[PDB]
């Protein structure tokens, strides 16, 4: 039924992003709100996340679950330990995708937070939430009676409306996890069944390689000298701006 | 730097063994490791390879879908499942290790371990 | 598809210079590396690439190729050449293979 809803989404990743407002500082988060998009009524609030939706860390289809990048590896978790708010804890209605269905009241900015093991992602920016009230009673919050007027809402609903966004051949994401001392040398260790692209300034010679097995450059002798570029496009990426570009 | 050894020894024809490579002086989870035999008076024969990270395993033609490879990272180990056997099997069987300073892709091997008897009879 | 051949024996006198050969198809563009072994003890890699040694090996050893012929030279042969040698080589297809043992007297 809904698997159809996912065919072009299974062929993305998520990834990790800059957010101006982590837990400490700023920082590289695997939840980055790139869009917060408040225009209808009754407080509704669709999230664009750079973490995924609504299939779970192999691209099967697991209803109520986010998969989100972890320095490479997509980890998964289930949604109701995600918890977010704008200027009062939110409640999310679903997600699919990179977009989240939230209900929201008004706030000057929206964080979005969950724990895994004893570390707590998150990550706040400050777009504006509105709260549009309906009519021409300037409600805070819906009234629990009254009469049915016209309004716009952000449905729960994921069927496809003809408004498309793009998918991207990701950029190679630099890891310095790959690139280690051995020998007195930089020794750069591609993860298995991947490739990178190591590019080296050292001896004036500047050396460009890319390999799937271990490589040890005996030119080299600081691992700062030296940069490993985890080669892999597999899956695409929506074009966010926090991402480098393909060639 | 070392690789150590264990587990073969003496045999039946058809049954089974194990051989077990223990690794030490090095991050073992990041290098290809390789099993290679050599019977008495007769040269080098590569039994398999595994590529450091359990995705890629190849083994000779001479010794194709019978046995099998694993390995530990996290406790350091390379098995070799030793199944199937046959007579002419009989060798001795070499823990070794991939060497890095490869230029074109040609998987030198660095480190050998020191060897394992492995002895199939009635 | 590929087989390394090399000559069963050699007989070589000290002091000397002396070749092993080894040879075989699409070995010229193919890595050739080239290992030295006593019967009992452990393979010792002496050549890692067409031309490099690896560290700690002495400078007397030195390979070569042309054409689709490789060789293993030993610039003053010593007792301590006397033990057998293999050449290797890697291949995407049967990947790794050695070739007959060419032993030294």
């Known amino acids: 039924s809904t698997e159809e809803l996912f065919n072009e989404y299974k062929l993305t990743r998520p990834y990790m992003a800059r957010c101006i407002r982590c837990a400490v500082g700023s920082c590289h988060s695997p939840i980055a709100i790139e869009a917060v998009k408040s225009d209808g009524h009754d407080g509704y609030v669709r999230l664009q996340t750079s973490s995924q939706y609504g299939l779970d860390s192999s691209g099967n289809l697991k209803g109520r679950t986010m998969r989100y990048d972890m320095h490479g590896t997509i980890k998964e978790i289930p949604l109701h330990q995600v918890s977010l708010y704008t200027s009062r804890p939110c409640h999310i209605v679903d997600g699919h995708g990179y977009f989240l269905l939230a209900r929201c009241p008004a706030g000057d900015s929206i964080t979005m937070e969950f724990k895994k093991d004893s570390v707590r992602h998150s990550c706040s920016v400050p777009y504006e939430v509105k709260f549009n009230p309906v009519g021409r009673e300037l409600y805070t919050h819906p009234p629990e009676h009254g009469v049915e007027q016209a309004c716009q809402v952000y449905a729960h609903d994921a069927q496809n409306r003809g408004a498309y966004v793009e998918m991207h051949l990701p950029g190679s994401e630099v890891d310095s996890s790959l690139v280690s001392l051995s020998g007195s040398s930089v020794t750069v260790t591609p993860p298995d069944g991947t490739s990178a692209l190591v590019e080296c300034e050292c001896g004036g010679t500047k050396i460009s390689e890319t390999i799937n097995k271990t490589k040890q450059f005996s030119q080299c002798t600081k691992k700062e000298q030296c940069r490993a570029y985890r080669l892999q496009n597999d899956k695409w990426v929506y074009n966010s701006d926090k991402l480098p570009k393909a060639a | 730097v070392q690789l150590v050894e264990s587990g073969g020894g003496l045999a039946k024809p058809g049954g089974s063994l194990r051989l077990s490579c223990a690794a030490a002086?090095?991050?073992?989870?990041?290098?290809?490791m390789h099993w290679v035999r050599q019977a008495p008076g007769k040269g080098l024969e590569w039994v398999s390879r595994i590529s450091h990270g359990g995705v890629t395993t190849r083994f000779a033609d001479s010794v194709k879908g019978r046995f099998t490879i694993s390995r530990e990272n996290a406790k350091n180990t390379l098995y070799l499942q030793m199944d199937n056997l046959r007579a002419e099997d009989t060798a001795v069987y070499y823990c070794?290790?991939?060497?890095?300073?490869?230029?074109?892709?040609?998987?030198?091997?660095?480190?050998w371990g020191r060897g394992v008897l492995v002895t199939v009879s009635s | 598809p590929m087989r390394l051949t090399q000559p069963r024996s050699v007989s070589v006198s000290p002091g000397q210079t002396a070749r092993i050969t080894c040879g075989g198809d699409?070995?010229?563009?193919?890595?050739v590396h080239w290992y030295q072994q006593k019967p009992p003890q452990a393979p010792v890699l002496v050549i890692y690439?067409?031309?490099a040694r690896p560290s700690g090996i002495p400078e007397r050893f030195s390979g070569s190729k042309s054409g689709n012929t490789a060789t293993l030279a030993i610039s003053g042969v010593e007792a301590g050449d006397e033990a057998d040698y293999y050449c290797?080589?890697?291949?995407?297809?049967?990947?790794?293979?050695f070739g007959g043992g060419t032993r030294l007297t």
């Open positions: 070794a290790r991939d060497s890095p300073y490869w230029g074109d892709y040609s998987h030198s091997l660095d480190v």
């Open positions: 002086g090095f991050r073992f989870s990041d290098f290809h």
């Open positions: 690439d067409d031309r």
């Open positions: 290797q080589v890697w291949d995407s297809s049967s990947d790794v293979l």
């Open positions: 699409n070995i010229g563009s193919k890595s």
